Amino acid sequence: NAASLVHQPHPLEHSWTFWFDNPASIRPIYTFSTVEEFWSVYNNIHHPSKLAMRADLYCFKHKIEPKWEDPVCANGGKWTVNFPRGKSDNGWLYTLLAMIGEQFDCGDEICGAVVNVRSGQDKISIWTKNASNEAAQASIGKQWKEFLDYNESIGFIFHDDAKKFDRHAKNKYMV
Numbered sequence: 001n002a003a004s005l006v007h008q009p010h011p012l013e014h015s016w017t018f019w020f021d022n023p024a025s026i027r028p029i030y031t032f033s034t035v036e037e038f039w040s041v042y043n044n045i046h047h048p049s050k051l052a053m054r055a056d057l058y059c060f061k062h063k064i065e066p067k068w069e070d071p072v073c074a075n076g077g078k079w080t081v082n083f084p085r086g087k088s089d090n091g092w093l094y095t096l097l098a099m100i101g102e103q104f105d106c107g108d109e110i111c112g113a114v115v116n117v118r119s120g121q122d123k124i125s126i127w128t129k130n131a132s133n134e135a136a137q138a139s140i141g142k143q144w145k146e147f148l149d150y151n152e153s154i155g156f157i158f159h160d161d162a163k164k165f166d167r168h169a170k171n172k173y174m175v
């Protein structure tokens with residue numbers, strides 16, 4: 001019948017899974033495939049301003065696990081921005097909307113995004129694949145900056161560098 005005709009969900013290009021890691025133990029929590037489902041889920045998850053300290057919240061394409069060791073992420077890396085503790089909610093949102101909406105030019109390279117809640121600063125990173133494709137990675141980083149109205153340099157860290165050099169990994173590109 002008509003019920004599902006006049007209130008038809010609007011499907012996204014990809015399915016996305018939110019994962020959480022709480023203050024190899026990163027649980028998935030909600031998978032969505034439609035706009036409706038996104039908002040439903042985003043409106044029942046805490047925004048970064050009300051997350052607990054040291055929490056990580058991930059939003060990755062379905063079947064990409066948010067781990068350096070995932071074979072889609074393995075040769076990839078991450079653009080990172082910083083915001084003050086408690087002032088990262090809009091950035092997170094604008095980031096989610098940019099990804100699920102397929103707004104990035106080089107959106108093929110996009111794996112997902114993560115907000116890291118820390119005392120002092122919040123960080124949001126976008127994870128991509130093909131770290132060695134500078135042209136692509138620079139496109140994404142610039143464009144993210146433009147989406148966010150961010151006015152500072154951002155950097156990109158190969159997952160291979162992160163794995164090897166924990167604290168000490170340097171940015172390979174900057175935009």
Ligand SMILES: C[n+]1cn([C@@H]2O[C@H](COP(=O)(O)OP(=O)(O)O)[C@@H](O)[C@H]2O)c2nc(N)[nH]c(=O)c21
Pocket residue numbers: 024054066067068069116118166167
């Ligand atoms: C994001 N991530 C972090 N780790 C490891 O877990 C640690 C968690 O560090 P953090 O909690 O990201 O920041 P903070 O400790 O400065 O507050 C990192 O230093 C990495 O050693 C990770 N280990 C794996 N295998 N995969 C991941 O995606 C990953």
